[PDB]
Amino acid sequence: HMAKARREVTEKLKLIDIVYELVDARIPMSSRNPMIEDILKNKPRIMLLNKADKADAAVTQQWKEHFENQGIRSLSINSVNGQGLNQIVPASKEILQEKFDRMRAKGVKPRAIRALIIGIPNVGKSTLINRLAKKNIAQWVKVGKELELLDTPGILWPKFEDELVGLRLAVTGAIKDSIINLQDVAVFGLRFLEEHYPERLKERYGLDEIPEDIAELFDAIGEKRGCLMSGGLINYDKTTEVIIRDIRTEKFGRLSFEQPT
Ligand SMILES: Nc1nc2c(ncn2[C@@H]2O[C@H](COP(=O)(O)OP(=O)(O)NP(=O)(O)O)[C@@H](O)[C@H]2O)c(=O)[nH]1
Numbered sequence: 001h002m003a004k005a006r007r008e009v010t011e012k013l014k015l016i017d018i019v020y021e022l023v024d025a026r027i028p029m030s031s032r033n034p035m036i037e038d039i040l041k042n043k044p045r046i047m048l049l050n051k052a053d054k055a056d057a058a059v060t061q062q063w064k065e066h067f068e069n070q071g072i073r074s075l076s077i078n079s080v081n082g083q084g085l086n087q088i089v090p091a092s093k094e095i096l097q098e099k100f101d102r103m104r105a106k107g108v109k110p111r112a113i114r115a116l117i118i119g120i121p122n123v124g125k126s127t128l129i130n131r132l133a134k135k136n137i138a139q140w141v142k143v144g145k146e147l148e149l150l151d152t153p154g155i156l157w158p159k160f161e162d163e164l165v166g167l168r169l170a171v172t173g174a175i176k177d178s179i180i181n182l183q184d185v186a187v188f189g190l191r192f193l194e195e196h197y198p199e200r201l202k203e204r205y206g207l208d209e210i211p212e213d214i215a216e217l218f219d220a221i222g223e224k225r226g227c228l229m230s231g232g233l234i235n236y237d238k239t240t241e242v243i244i245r246d247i248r249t250e251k252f253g254r255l256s257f258e259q260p261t
């Protein structure tokens with residue numbers, strides 16, 4: 001993991017011209033893997049804010065400006081329906097123009113661009129590859145006569161100690177919900193919604209007013225959806241799942257858990 005997947009990237013980097021770093025548009029910063037980026041020094045790259053359809057469009061625009069102003073070419077895309085994928089090859093050619101023109105002038109003929117797909121788990125690396133390759137393949141994945149891709153497994157990093165970063169990753173689905181306390185993530189989700197998207201929270205569960213006590217809000221949602229366990233008692237485990245499901249399936253509309261600056 002922290003070593004296995006890491007060396008796999010270190011090796012494959014020697015065979016590629018450019019890196020396609022996929023991040024979750026809902027959390028462009030918290031979904032960036034510092035451990036991996038460190039290995040990516042000097043190698044050309046494009047930051048791909050995937051799942052842009054699930055994020056707040058205005059905030060996404062802010063993140064793109066933020067990265068570009070730092071010298072990082074960025075593109076917001078939807079790997080499921082194709083939004084923005086037509087900009088990847090064009091961008092890649094512009095970034096590698098100098099390198100390629102230099103090789104051509106030295107007598108080395110042009111070859112198909114070789115790119116590496118990297119990113120945290122569940123960010124959409126396979127979806128993107130399958131869409132670009134126009135085939136269910138997800139090793140050198142061919143994409144027309146202009147691109148060749150290499151896929152890598154989802155990777156996290158050791159010191160992500162910042163509890164906030166962990167909560168954002170957990171709520172968005174970057175971590176298997178089996179090894180974590182899902183209710184704490186649901187509590188984080190609800191507080192986030194109450195602070196940033198209160199109207200959506202109310203309409204979603206038909207709440208005339210949002211309860212001041214987080215536990216009370218859990219009960220409201222439970223009974224509302226019928227999450228009962230022992231002849232009437234609220235099942236908080238099932239209620240937790242509903243909340244997490246609602247957030248991930250866009251039941252609260254487009255969400256962005258962080259903004260630049
Ligand atoms: N709305 C939306 N969903 C997307 C997008 N890209 C991927 N997804 C969804 O996100 C989920 C995970 O995608 P997947 O390609 O398996 O991710 P991955 O990064 O290859 N996973 P791993 O790291 O485990 O190999 C899938 O349910 C997929 O349909 C996107 O742009 N928009």
Ligand SMILES: [Mg+2]
Binds near residue numbers: 125126127138153
């Ligand atoms: Mg995959």
